Amino acid sequence: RALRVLVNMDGVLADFEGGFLRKFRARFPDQPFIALEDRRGFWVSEQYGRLRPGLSEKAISIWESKNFFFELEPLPGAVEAVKEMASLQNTDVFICTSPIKMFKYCPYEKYAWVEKYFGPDFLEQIVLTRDKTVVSADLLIDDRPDITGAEPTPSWEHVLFTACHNQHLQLQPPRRRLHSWADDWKAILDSKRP
Amino acid sequence: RALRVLVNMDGVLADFEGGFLRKFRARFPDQPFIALEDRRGFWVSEQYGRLRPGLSEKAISIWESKNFFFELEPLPGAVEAVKEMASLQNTDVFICTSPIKMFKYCPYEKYAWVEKYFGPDFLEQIVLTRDKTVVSADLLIDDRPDITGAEPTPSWEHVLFTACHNQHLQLQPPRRRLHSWADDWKAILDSKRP
Ligand SMILES: Cc1cn([C@H]2C[C@H](O)[C@@H](COP(=O)(O)O)O2)c(=O)[nH]c1=O
Ligand SMILES: Cc1cn([C@H]2C[C@H](O)[C@@H](COP(=O)(O)O)O2)c(=O)[nH]c1=O
Ligand SMILES: [Mg+2]
Ligand SMILES: [Mg+2]
Ligand SMILES: [Mg+2]
Ligand SMILES: [Mg+2]
């Protein structure tokens, strides 16, 4: 009976794109890179591998490194918005996030990051999964255009969170965006309430 | 269109009760303990705290310790059964597990344990969450009697996996058990298929 909202972590709460670019340039100063304006498509590794041989593996090495996830900066407005959202009557918020294959640091640091920005009690709201379609809710706010998995008819409406890699994408109606946390997220939530 | 089954980790795949008792007795040999036959109720910490002052905190210290989760032994038949189950046509298996509050080791070691017993490709099937009711499926096989959360009407049927702490519990019809992995799990799955 409470509206349930899944909020994606990387590219929505945490600035994966910015953190990755900064750390890639610092580690690999002699390699070419993709400026954020020129990012296209969800997969960083795939765009970097097209740029040249061996860059896909070098990109992956950034996010496999210790401290990568933990040191991501929150996207503007994200912490404030999600705190407000969670505090709303008849509204339950979960943070829904996919870990990488290499599991040494990523799960741990994601829990640490949520504690850092939202406090210990918000840890109970984390769902770590590679398949978001088996998580049920009214809304999923997520920067990845193509969200698929084991469930062919997910219960949520996917609202596309704007990111550098998707900002030029024309969606099929009635697919809808949340343009940033400065955009009117309350209106989107209210549109799904009884 | 594929039957989806959530399989709980602790108390179903991994022998939490046995591992905990062994490590508690080794660390705290001068303290009283609860033999598995005498376990009642999901919460170990709560039964130990009733046994005496300070034992709840000493129990918690076992599973907060490094290597606790990783070193759990699989329950008899569990690895074999889940491998077979996953390989069945029109059947998708996810491992659905709740982490502790202290996140330094538990998420990491749970991923490590799944890799160890099921292989790298099975990592994609893990769902870490404190709330199982927001995970949608046809079945949930889980040793905890009371499974509640944000979703008042979960999409799964909860089948109670027998454990020392629940073996004496009379369930309200039509609630049903899977008595061990030697019991006929295929019959339970088939009962939910079209
Ligand atoms: C951009 C990118 C992210 N990832 C991982 C990083 C995060 O663990 C996961 C985040 O996905 P999500 O934002 O859909 O939850 O995707 C890759 O493995 N390769 C990539 O190219
Ligand atoms: C028995 C017990 C388990 N736990 C934790 C251990 C596991 O992380 C989690 C397993 O729960 P689950 O088997 O329902 O997924 O419960 C406690 O925090 N206190 C306890 O007394
Ligand atoms: Mg994302
Ligand atoms: Mg609320
Ligand atoms: Mg369990
Ligand atoms: Mg299968």
UniProtKB/Swiss-Prot annotation, chains A, B:
Catalytic class of the enzyme: hydrolase
**What's this protein's name?**
5'(3')-deoxyribonucleotidase, mitochondrial
Give me the residues that bind Mg(2+), please.
Answer: 8, 10, 143
Keyword match Cytoplasm = no
- Purpose: Dephosphorylates specifically the 5' and 2'(3')-phosphates of uracil and thymine deoxyribonucleotides, and so protects mitochondrial DNA replication from excess dTTP. Has only marginal activity towards dIMP and dGMP.
Q: Where does substrate bind?
A: 10, 16, 42-44, 63, 97, 132
Q: What tissues express this gene product?
A: Highly expressed in heart, brain and skeletal muscle. Detected at very low levels in kidney and pancreas.
Highest lineage ranks of the organism?
Eukaryota, Metazoa, Chordata, Craniata, Vertebrata
Its assembly, as annotated, is:
Homodimer.
Q: What is its EC number?
A: 3.1.3.-
GO CC annotations, alphabetized: mitochondrial matrix; mitochondrion
Q: What is its main location?
A: mitochondrion
